[PDB]
């Protein structure tokens, strides 16, 4: 349900 993303977002 939560947002994830590429690690460069921090």
């Amino acid at each position: 349900d939560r947002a994830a993303g590429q690690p460069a977002g921090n």
Partner: antibody, heavy 119, light 113 residues
Framework: QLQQSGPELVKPGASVKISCKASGYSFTGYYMHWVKQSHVKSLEWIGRIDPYDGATSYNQNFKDKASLTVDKSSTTGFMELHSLTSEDSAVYYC??????????????WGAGTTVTVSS | DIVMTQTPLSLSVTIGQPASISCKSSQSLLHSNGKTYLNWLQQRPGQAPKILMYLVSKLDPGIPDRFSGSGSETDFTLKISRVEAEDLGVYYCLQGTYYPFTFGSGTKLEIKR
């Protein structure tokens, strides 16, 4: 799927707030990012925001220059730029970090907002 | 900040001919989880950037299969098997492994006819 606000003329030292309206997907489930384009050969990541709880992550270059917020009721993201200088004249994009095949990438982009800093 | 270098600066390719673009990162983009977060973007004039490929080699579902990607952990290549008219624009690599995100210099592709 992402609609940005219109072009802005800003006096140097003033501030501006631009918006990114989302539609057609679960707003709180995906990060909203902002990107600065000073010209055709420059792209810079400004920061991201989690619309679920408003948590933000910023590029160190844009801390104290930018601040990201969301309004969940209208499914809109906002970026406010503070105390602008001529180096802040650029085109500003919002993007959704989408999900496909279990992997994450910027799959939807706004059309861009032109900000011109001038007296 | 990771420095992303693209070569060539500009490229001129005839319709139906192959095209090749390279990207170099100042550090290895292999992350602890085993994923190499390297993206290729295309920006047509007057339009927003568009992700073509992510994770070095994976195409976005709406991108034609004439695009392909290869690379190691620091050196990457975007290939167009047969260039078409809609492929003009500026191509950027974007690294997503190390904070913050950093884009490449950009490579201009002109279509020869």
């Amino acid at each position: 799927q992402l609609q940005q606000s219109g072009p802005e003329l800003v006096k140097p030292g003033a501030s501006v707030k631009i918006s990114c309206k989302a539609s057609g997907y679960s707003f709180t489930g995906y990060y909203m990012h902002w990107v600065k384009q000073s010209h055709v050969k420059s792209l810079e990541w400004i920061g991201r925001i989690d619309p679920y709880d408003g948590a933000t992550s910023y590029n160190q270059n844009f801390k104290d220059k930018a601040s990201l917020t969301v309004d969940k009721s209208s499914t809109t993201g906002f970026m406010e730029l503070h105390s602008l200088t001529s180096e802040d004249s650029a085109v500003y994009y919002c993007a959704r970090e989408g999900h496909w095949d279990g992997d994450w990438y910027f799959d939807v982009w706004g059309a861009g907002t032109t900000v011109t800093v001038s007296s | 900040d990771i420095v992303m270098t693209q070569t060539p600066l500009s490229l001129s390719v005839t319709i139906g001919q192959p095209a090749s673009i390279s990207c170099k990162s100042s550090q290895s983009l292999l992350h602890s989880n085993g994923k190499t977060y390297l993206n290729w973007l295309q920006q047509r004039p007057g339009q927003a950037p568009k992700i073509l490929m992510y994770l070095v080699s994976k195409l976005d579902p709406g991108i034609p299969d004439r695009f392909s990607g290869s690379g190691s952990e620091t050196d990457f290549t975007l290939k167009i098997s047969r260039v078409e008219a809609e492929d003009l624009g500026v191509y950027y690599c974007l690294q997503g492994t190390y904070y913050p995100f950093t884009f490449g210099s950009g490579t201009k592709l002109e279509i020869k006819r």
